[PDB]
Design an enzyme around this catalytic site. Structure first.
Site, PDB file in Angstrom:
ATOM      1  N   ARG A   7       0.728  -1.250   0.000  1.00  0.00           N
ATOM      2  CA  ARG A   7       0.000   0.000   0.000  1.00  0.00           C
ATOM      3  C   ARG A   7       0.758   1.302   0.000  1.00  0.00           C
ATOM      4  NH1 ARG A   7      -3.935  -4.030   2.049  1.00  0.00           N
ATOM      5  NH2 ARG A   7      -5.356  -3.041   3.614  1.00  0.00           N
ATOM      6  N   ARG A  15       0.625   4.606  -8.455  1.00  0.00           N
ATOM      7  CA  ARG A  15       0.219   4.500  -9.846  1.00  0.00           C
ATOM      8  C   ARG A  15      -0.269   3.040  -9.922  1.00  0.00           C
ATOM      9  NH1 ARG A  15       2.412   8.520 -14.587  1.00  0.00           N
ATOM     10  NH2 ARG A  15       2.615  10.461 -13.427  1.00  0.00           N
ATOM     11  N   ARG A  68     -15.748  11.297  -4.128  1.00  0.00           N
ATOM     12  CA  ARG A  68     -14.668  12.313  -3.898  1.00  0.00           C
ATOM     13  C   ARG A  68     -15.064  13.598  -4.645  1.00  0.00           C
ATOM     14  NH1 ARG A  68     -10.166  10.256  -1.748  1.00  0.00           N
ATOM     15  NH2 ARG A  68      -9.723   8.298  -2.879  1.00  0.00           N
ATOM     16  N   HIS A  84      -9.674   3.982 -11.956  1.00  0.00           N
ATOM     17  CA  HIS A  84      -9.571   4.392 -10.552  1.00  0.00           C
ATOM     18  C   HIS A  84      -8.095   4.777 -10.364  1.00  0.00           C
ATOM     19  CE1 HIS A  84      -9.733   5.117  -6.368  1.00  0.00           C
ATOM     20  NE2 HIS A  84      -8.761   4.246  -6.167  1.00  0.00           N
ATOM     21  N   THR A 113      -4.181   6.208   2.655  1.00  0.00           N
ATOM     22  CA  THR A 113      -5.585   6.395   2.251  1.00  0.00           C
ATOM     23  C   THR A 113      -6.445   5.461   3.071  1.00  0.00           C
ATOM     24  OG1 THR A 113      -6.961   6.443   0.185  1.00  0.00           O
ATOM     25  CG2 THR A 113      -5.154   4.739   0.257  1.00  0.00           C
ATOM     26  N   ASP A 164     -14.003   7.686  -5.936  1.00  0.00           N
ATOM     27  CA  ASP A 164     -13.781   8.852  -6.788  1.00  0.00           C
ATOM     28  C   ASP A 164     -15.012   9.748  -7.012  1.00  0.00           C
ATOM     29  OD1 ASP A 164     -10.953   8.111  -7.504  1.00  0.00           O
ATOM     30  OD2 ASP A 164     -12.027   6.470  -8.529  1.00  0.00           O
ATOM     31  N   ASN A 195      -6.168  -2.454  -5.430  1.00  0.00           N
ATOM     32  CA  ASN A 195      -5.950  -1.152  -6.071  1.00  0.00           C
ATOM     33  C   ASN A 195      -6.056  -0.463  -7.361  1.00  0.00           C
ATOM     34  OD1 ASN A 195      -3.822   1.116  -4.171  1.00  0.00           O
ATOM     35  ND2 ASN A 195      -5.644   1.491  -5.409  1.00  0.00           N
TER      36      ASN A 195
END
Lengths: 331, 331, 331, 331
Positions: A98, A105, A168, A192, A247, A165, A137
């Site tokens: 993580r 990326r 977000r 994502h 995160t 997102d 991820n």
């Protein structure tokens, strides 16, 4: 003879049971925030937590356990193995590798498919009819990995995608009108990460054709600041970690919001990752995210939006980025 | 061709499911208040409501349906028959003959066993492994009727008992100290009506032996006002109806509090009705209420309290009142 | 001219307001877990987070902010200064010097009073009529420090005390009967650490005099294993940190459970720290924890339990340990 | 001397307080359903219920009171007078003359303004800075009456409007796609009754310009069945009452959803009634409903939608119907 044997009376046959669980692979901050919150709600009466870092787990686990007197979920179990996942309704994979200021990326990728080959399949051998939310991820590419590596119907195998997102987004978006992100609507799909085509074509604060942000158009893309909401979105993922050094929360809430929907059979539509295998030009087992309806049984159905020539353009594009990437195996 | 056929995409195999429901027989004010509240919580994702007064039901039902946009339970069904109950996890019987200023005693009894013979068994033919909460009244004697008439293990067949009363009690009780009824503890058992032996022996506002209301004893029975809390309790059932002309809300909340426990497998102990068949001297298939632990699978175990010579006296007494009453059939 | 100026219409006078906030000093894991949870509930519509580690905060803060679309609390603010706390209803101090395998005792003490002298008073200059929950540790001695250093009526100045422990207790305790920690009752007071006299005299699983754990006595102290529940309790604080390397979740839940009570004016009694200045023999401005009733306005009233000769003994003892410790200032 | 004087200790100065209430005028089924639900949430710690039918009230009230042990609102008061409303934050008027198979139109009008002249103003003399939600019916015209008769800034004086209808709408609407009414969006405004212009121009199931129901247009008005959703909507109000003999639950939930927003300062936009005095052609103190943003302080701002020539047509029309109606007084 005993207080037990004295205070409580054992009503004969049927003094044992079992049914519908939640399990979370790895409790890295995320695996964990996506834990507590499943708790600060009544999604599961048995939540088993599987980690390989045996140490922290039986620590963290016991923390939640000491915590009992507040939860509405009596059983909280932990394992070093997946045997401890027997008959889960929902498994949420959040183990891998993580974040790192810069790094982040789709770098944590060859790295994670490895994490997977191991972690994932095996979990499944236990709860054969399970349903998976993939948070790791890479969600896209991992959803794919897992999809592949597991072998059960996508519907079952889902991913965090952009639910995150988009949220977000609704945030920032609403940061400007002075209206709740619940009360403003906008969709960001594709990837994502940085290939995120929001989809302005359809952005309310009332209704479509009604209050579409388009009809008043201080543009929204083709200028006059709003692109930035989007640039703010993507960047936004990055800026967080740079600072708290990860995160956590917001990913958690997102997921539990996926669970919530699945578990209570809400059939609440969602932007999640799945096989766009042959949608809007994409024709190759590329998994990116699209607005889909979620219930008890997985993704039920998909929602095929109206991307403008290029909204379809960009999406067509991600698809592909995401695509070669998938010329995979450990090779 | 259609907006449907245009907006939504049907993710192939597995586009149907089913699982864990709530059902409530009859929506008389109660059947109903015990409805809405199951809703103002997430106990059930399918709640089917079976009534024979076809009219009001499809009215009331549709009211809840129009109500969707607030519920976290997508499916709300209604039937004139029990077929509409297929595979319920919990059935709550609240149909019979409700209340009348004066009347109310165990009068609504030969009257209701009739209501039962019909209503109950049949429901069961549908959800064979169901679990029943009996609210009707008579709860004791009906629990018995149903118990009998159904034929599944008590554990499965439960009753509203005094969960209600005890609560009614903790209320008043706390009305005097200026402490929350959650934060004061006291138990009233025996019968749900006028044979209610509270059980002062064990009444905290801290702990047992600790703050037992006994050690400071402005008595609690053998004088100096507190008997009244109890006289206030029982009477208290009556005074309500005299005025709004029925007993609604508080019965509802109680039940849902039973459901809550059952469904989330809380193994929260409760005062409910069951077979004290051979406890504290009672030796005859008399069902009155006693503190029991409730989970997924029914009553799991019983809690055998310390009634003082006569606390046991009185209880021994109810048992019996309640008992001949049961020299039953429609005969 | 603008979408703003176009989409939204500004209903003239009264387009600004303010009222009832929550604030949390420092977001160390705890400060933080005690955060999210205040969120996974509707305690506050404005929650301001004050930290001095400016970096992580505007990171963590923004994490929660991105998180908006889930919260039922529109405003979430952050400051480097206490100015950012203006007109809080409840302030929760969780800044100092947290934990170390071994260390942990009342070691983090001269260390923290320092943290306080600074942190605390000043916060108060802002929300003059605020109410404080002290979580730091040391809770006792700090409550005292703060009490002292602030200068407002204890009632206002409260501490985490053993609400925690007692809960930790009800847990284990229930781990043995197979009954919910809500449904078992027991009190542990004195100190929050190792001077913890549980108070067996009063330990239900029904009622006092009723099901007091005493009347069946496999002892509870004077032998036959149960002391261990208590030894398990205390040790229990330690074992956690050794493993996850800190004490997070469970402290959080506890507090929010204090807030919950305060804010909704529940007048739910609680074991919290306050001035036992002249109770059960203690006669010196020693703050340890005792069962008290909490509402809107602070501690309203105290609950004076029945400690057995020595329950009073031990308590009398802590009091004192805790006491010289307080021959304080920075001197 | 007493158990009180013995068990509880009164922490000296500050042993009394007060702050932020909810009050509901009349408990007719509605006044009432809009009650319980305010309870099955934590909107208010003091909820006072004012009715003139003294009988049923102290009955119904006591029902809720017996109900305490479940609520998270300690104080529940009742009055025959408005004195019992002192310092409410939100007052909800639901007293007048309710429903009759056929009747129901704006018939219950000269009838209710009367109910008002009395009921309303007077309530206000008590909680001078109160905020009112008007549920009665007539909501429009009554909002106006009350507005007028009270004399405080609309913002403060609000009405149930179509929040209801719109919801009724999202329901049906979603009944066809197989998507949650949360997850489908559509707005119905104008009048709360039969002058209901839905506003198809803006109807998502994704986004505006995005999934606007318009771009696929099986029409939506100008044919091919959907008008019916709207005809189903309006009629839908009627069909209910014909059957259960009143409109209860769904009105309740709606309101509490208004409260929720107001109280937690959600600034969640809503369709509610207010003075369209000089919007989209209407120029006369006509109150109908429009999408507005609600917070702590009332209606903050309005949302000026894009009605098509006639969407504006129809609205322009209601306005007026609603208008002469208002050549009022008791004259």
């Amino acid at each position: 003879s005993t207080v037990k044997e004295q205070l409580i009376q054992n009503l004969v046959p049927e003094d044992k049971l079992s049914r519908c669980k939640i399990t979370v692979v790895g409790v890295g901050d995320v695996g964990m925030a996506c834990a507590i919150s499943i708790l600060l709600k009544g999604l599961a009466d048995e939540l088993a937590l599987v980690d390989a870092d045996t140490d922290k787990l039986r620590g963290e686990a016991l923390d939640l356990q000491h915590g009992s007197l507040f939860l509405s979920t009596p059983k909280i179990v932990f394992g070093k193995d997946y045997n401890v996942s027997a008959n889960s309704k929902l498994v949420i994979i959040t183990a891998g590798a993580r974040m790192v200021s810069g790094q982040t990326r789709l770098d944590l990728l060859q790295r994670n498919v490895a994490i997977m080959k191991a972690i994932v399949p095996g979990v499944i051998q236990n709860s054969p009819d399970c349903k998976i939310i993939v948070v790791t991820n890479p969600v896209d590419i991992l959803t794919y990995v897992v999809w592949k590596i597991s072998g059960f119907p996508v519907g079952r195998v889902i991913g965090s995608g952009c639910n995150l997102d988009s949220a977000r987004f609704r945030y920032l978006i609403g940061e400007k009108l002075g209206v709740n992100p619940t009360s403003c609507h906008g969709w960001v799909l594709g990837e994502h990460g940085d290939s995120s085509v929001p989809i302005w074509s359809g952005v309310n604060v009332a209704g479509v054709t009604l209050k579409s942000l388009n009809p008043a158009i201080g543009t929204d893309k083709n200028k006059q600041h709003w692109k930035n909401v989007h640039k703010q979105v993507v960047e936004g993922g990055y800026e967080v970690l740079d600072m708290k050094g990860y995160t956590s929360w917001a990913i958690g809430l997102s997921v539990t919001d996926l669970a919530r929907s699945i578990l209570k059979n809400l059939k609440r539509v969602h932007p999640v990752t799945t096989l766009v295998k042959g949608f809007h030009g994409i024709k190759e087992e590329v998994f990116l995210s699209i607005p889909c309806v979620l219930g008890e049984s997985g993704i039920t159905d998909f929602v095929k939006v109206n991307m403008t020539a290029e909204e379809e353009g960009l999406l067509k594009k991600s698809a592909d980025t995401l695509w070669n990437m998938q010329k995979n195996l450990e090779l």
